[PDB]
């Protein structure tokens, strides 16, 4: 008697609305990354385990790890007709690493020589382009680094090193509304409406020009922006959804029989934290570090990760995830992440001896991912232990919860997280705690930590670069910028009409591998 017009061959997946336009160097969230990575294709591609292989580059050579020479495979094309060359990379990087454009993934271009005189103050030193990126001929180009960085070739597959079409450098305000990439998929040019319907859905179709490493086996995707994971799960069970990325915590004790060999569970490189800016009342200076070492010692992580998540989380032991190489669960000074009310009530008194407390403590979250349970649990625990009044504050959308944080327009503590990009521990620490990072929401500034990490980013071998990270975490254990809570155990579930679902190292499914029919 009715129905839909889409073919029963598009693979329906869940998603969320991007808080920022679809520009590579302008997105710092997974809700937009899981579409940018479909649309574009950079110098290197990551497989499921996380090992990089040459995607567009023909060779990436060097002699002493400070001078790099990159060549490009001839014969690539954006989905517009214009070729891919060295200029499409050099100009995109130069545009991403500019102070005037104010991009969120700018700090990523820090290792490159000539970054100080391009990013920073717009006065007393003005050259518009970096002096490390040189273009030899139409195809190959050379890159210079400040100091020899160990993990440089590994990060070239990130979504901030993507090329951009020539016709993007003339109007970057329309590009973010209709991107033109060169990757496996492409935005379905809709004759019966637009491809991207804000806060509703977005669908992609394969790119007939792509000949690379991630050729799609399905015939198009459709991300559907849901309002709650309860409805997402009901749809997954009813046959209206093909892959559910994150099972809601209200269905973790029934999924084993509801899905029944259509699910999987394993470690992931994600974490969860509770942040509070350094610009709030009573939360700055020393009282404000005591008032964070107190909040960190008044939360019962083993009880929350057992009564709410049914055992599919891991209480945090440091400021990174557990599935990364070189991770250590026995750092000295770690016994500041343990539950201890007799100490949570000493630190509050040591802070009130500097300034009394008055007001409410609000913890803000986005209600479209199933955070209400653990947020309320944390709030009740803090209230019971300290005596202050703490509450939860829900907001309807991630894209609208992030736009208040990004422009410093929030006035309460908030949840936050981080989903890894490449399997390196420094990637979980630098973009969140360096001086002027794009995703440094609290406002942390510590030159000692910045230098102690920049001295680890230059170690000779790879095993001597992890001990220095573990030594650099000893300063975060003393300052406590954010409160780490737990690490993830990703559970995904698919339906009957799908046959090749597999997940990557950071919990996302392996699109371009999902075979439906």
């Amino acid at each position: 008697c009715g129905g839909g017009v889409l073919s029963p061959d598009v693979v329906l997946v869940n998603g969320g609305e991007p808080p920022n336009p679809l520009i590579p160097t302008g997105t710092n969230d997974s809700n937009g990354g899981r579409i940018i990575d479909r649309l574009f294709a950079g110098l290197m591609s990551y497989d499921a385990v996380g090992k990089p292989s040459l995607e567009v580059a023909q060779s990436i050579e060097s002699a002493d790890n400070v001078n790099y020479r990159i060549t490009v495979k001839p014969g690539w094309k954006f989905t517009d007709g214009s070729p891919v060359t060295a200029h499409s990379f050099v100009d995109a990087w130069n545009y991403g690493a500019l102070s005037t454009n104010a991009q969120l993934q700018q700090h990523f271009f820090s290792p490159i020589e000539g970054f100080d005189d391009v990013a920073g103050a717009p006065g007393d030193k003005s050259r518009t382009t970096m002096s490390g990126l040189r273009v030899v001929n139409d195809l190959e180009f050379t890159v210079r680094l400040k100091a020899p960085t160990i993990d440089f070739t590994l990060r070239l597959g990130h979504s901030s090193f993507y090329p951009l079409p020539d016709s993007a450098f003339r109007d970057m305000a329309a590009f973010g509304r209709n991107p033109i990439g060169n990757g496996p998929y492409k935005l379905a040019d809709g004759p019966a409406g637009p491809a991207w319907e804000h806060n509703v859905r977005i669908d992609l179709v394969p790119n007939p020009d792509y000949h690379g490493n991630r050729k799609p086996r399905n015939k198009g995707l459709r991300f559907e922006f849901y309002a709650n994971l309860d409805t997402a799960y009901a749809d997954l069970l009813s046959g209206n959804l093909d892959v559910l990325d994150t099972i809601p915590p209200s269905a973790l004790t029934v999924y084993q029989r509801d899905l029944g060999d259509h699910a999987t569970s394993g470690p992931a490189a994600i974490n969860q934290t509770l942040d509070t800016p350094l610009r709030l009342p009573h939360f700055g200076g020393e009282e404000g570090r005591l008032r964070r070492l107190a909040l960190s010692a008044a939360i019962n992580r083993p009880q929350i990760c057992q009564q709410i998540f049914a055992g599919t989380r891991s209480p945090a032991r440091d400021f990174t995830a557990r599935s990364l190489p070189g991770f250590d669960p026995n750092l000295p000074g770690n016994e500041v992440l343990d539950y201890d009310p007799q100490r949570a009530r000493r630190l509050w008194a040591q802070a009130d001896a500097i300034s009394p407390w008055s007001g409410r403590y609000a913890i803000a979250y986005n209600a479209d991912a199933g955070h209400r349970d653990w947020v309320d649990a944390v709030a009740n625990s803090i209230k019971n232990v300290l005596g202050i009044d703490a509450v939860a504050a829900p907001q309807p959308t991630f894209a609208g919860f992030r736009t208040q944080i990004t422009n410093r327009a929030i006035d309460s503590a908030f949840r936050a997280g981080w989903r890894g990009d490449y399997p390196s521990m420094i990637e979980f620490l630098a973009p969140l705690f360096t001086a002027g990072a794009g995703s440094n929401d609290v406002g942390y500034i510590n030159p000692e930590f910045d230098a102690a990490l920049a001295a680890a980013e230059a170690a000779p071998t790879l095993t001597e670069s992890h001990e220095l990270v573990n030594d650099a975490q000893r300063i975060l254990f003393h300052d406590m910028p954010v409160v780490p809570l737990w690490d993830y155990i990703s559970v995904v579930g698919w339906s009957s009409q799908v046959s090749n679902v597999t997940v990557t190292w950071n919990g996302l499914p392996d699109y371009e591998n999902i075979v439906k029919a």
């Binding site: 997105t27 969230d29 997974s30 981080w418 989903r419 990009d421």
Partner: peptide, 4 residues
């Protein structure tokens, strides 16, 4: 990036 930041988790959803």
């Amino acid at each position: 990036a930041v988790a959803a």
